Amino acid sequence: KVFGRCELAAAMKRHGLDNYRGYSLGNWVCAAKFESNFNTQATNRNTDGSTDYGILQINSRWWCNDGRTPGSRNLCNIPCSALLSSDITASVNCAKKIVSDGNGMNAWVAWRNRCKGTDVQAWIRGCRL
Ligand SMILES: [Cl-]
Ligand SMILES: [Cl-]
Ligand SMILES: [Cl-]
């Protein structure tokens, strides 16, 4: 599913991501924009052989099981395929664990490089939330 910008903001809020660990909704929407362009089915293969999955490009080295990332963990206790669903529940619940892991949203390199320090509220501007 490719979400609309406000549609995704609303879904993230519904699932308790808004201001989670102090990160406003615009941060999460911005991260999703640059990780996946709001496409739940996004996948990308990393140089180390791991793969990133879903709207927040969650990585199989630590967070989910895909059966083909040697030496990896599955800390969210989910198949990576769950992160591709039109229902963002699994992605949100896993993101909550990731952002609580110590480095906040810096876990998402694209958030650090493209969202951090910017006017992230622009991502939820105009949205009925
Ligand atoms: Cl915001
Ligand atoms: Cl594996
Ligand atoms: Cl980047």
Number of other residues whose CB lies within 10 A of the CB of residue 66? 17
Q: Are 109 and 34 in contact (CB under 8 A)?
A: no
> Domain residues of the chain, as ranges?
1-129
Amino acid, single-letter form, for residue 116: K
Residues with active-site annotation:
35, 52
Kindly report the CATH number that applies to the domain delimited by 1-129: 1.10.530.10
Distance 53 CA to ligand 1 centre (A): 24
> In this structure, which residues have their CB less than 5 angstroms from ion ligand 1?
24, 26, 120-121
The two beta strands, 43-45 and 58-59, are unpaired
* Distance from residue 72's CA to the centre of ligand 1 (Å): 33
Please name which ligand lies nearest the alpha carbon of 79.
Answer: 2
Residue 101 labeled ligand binder: yes
> After which residues does the chain become discontinuous at a C–N distance over 2.5 Å?
none
